[PDB]
C-alpha cells in the first residue's frame, strides 16, 4: 500500500536523525568507556549484576536494522548504557564518573531531538 511506504519513508528519516543523535552522543565519549559490549571474558559475572546490558555498538545495529520506532525506544537504550555503569561501578571511579558526564552532557542533545522529532513529526 502507498500508506505502508509513507510509513516506511518516517521510520528511514527517524533512523537518520537517530543516527545524527547517536553520533553526537558518542562524541560525549571520548574515552569508549561506552563504545562496546562490556566483555563477559573478562567481567564474568557481569549478567548477575546487570540483567539488560547495552552498548553503542549494539545500539547502532539496532538503529541500522530500523529498530527503533520512535524517540523513547531510542533513549531507553542510551539510559541503560548510564544507568547499568553506574550500578556496576562505584562513584570514585573513572567508569561511573564517565557515565555522569556522557549523561549531563547527552541531555542537551536529547532535548532539541525531541523538540525534531514533534516537530518534523
Same mark, same amino acid.
Given at each position: 500500500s502507498m500508506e505502508q511506504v509513507a510509513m516506511e519513508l518516517r521510520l528511514t528519516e527517524l533512523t537518520r536523525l537517530l543516527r545524527s543523535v547517536l553520533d553526537q552522543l558518542q562524541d560525549k565519549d571520548p574515552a569508549r568507556?561506552? !563504545?562496546?559490549?562490556?566483555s563477559l571474558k573478562e567481567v564474568p559475572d557481569y549478567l548477575d549484576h546487570i540483567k539488560h546490558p547495552m552498548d553503542f555498538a549494539t545500539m547502532r545495529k539496532r538503529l541500522e536494522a530500523q529498530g527503533?520506532?520512535?524517540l523513547h525506544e531510542f533513549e531507553e537504550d542510551f539510559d541503560l548504557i548510564i544507568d547499568n555503569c553506574m550500578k556496576y561501578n !562505584?562513584?570514585?571511579?573513572v567508569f561511573y564518573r564517565a557515565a555522569v558526564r556522557l549523561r549531563d552532557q547527552g541531555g542537551v542533545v536529547l532535548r532539541q531531538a525531541r523538540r525534531e522529532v514533534d516537530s518534523i513529526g
Open positions: 568507556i561506552f !563504545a562496546q559490549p562490556v527503533y520506532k520512535n !562505584a562513584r570514585d571511579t
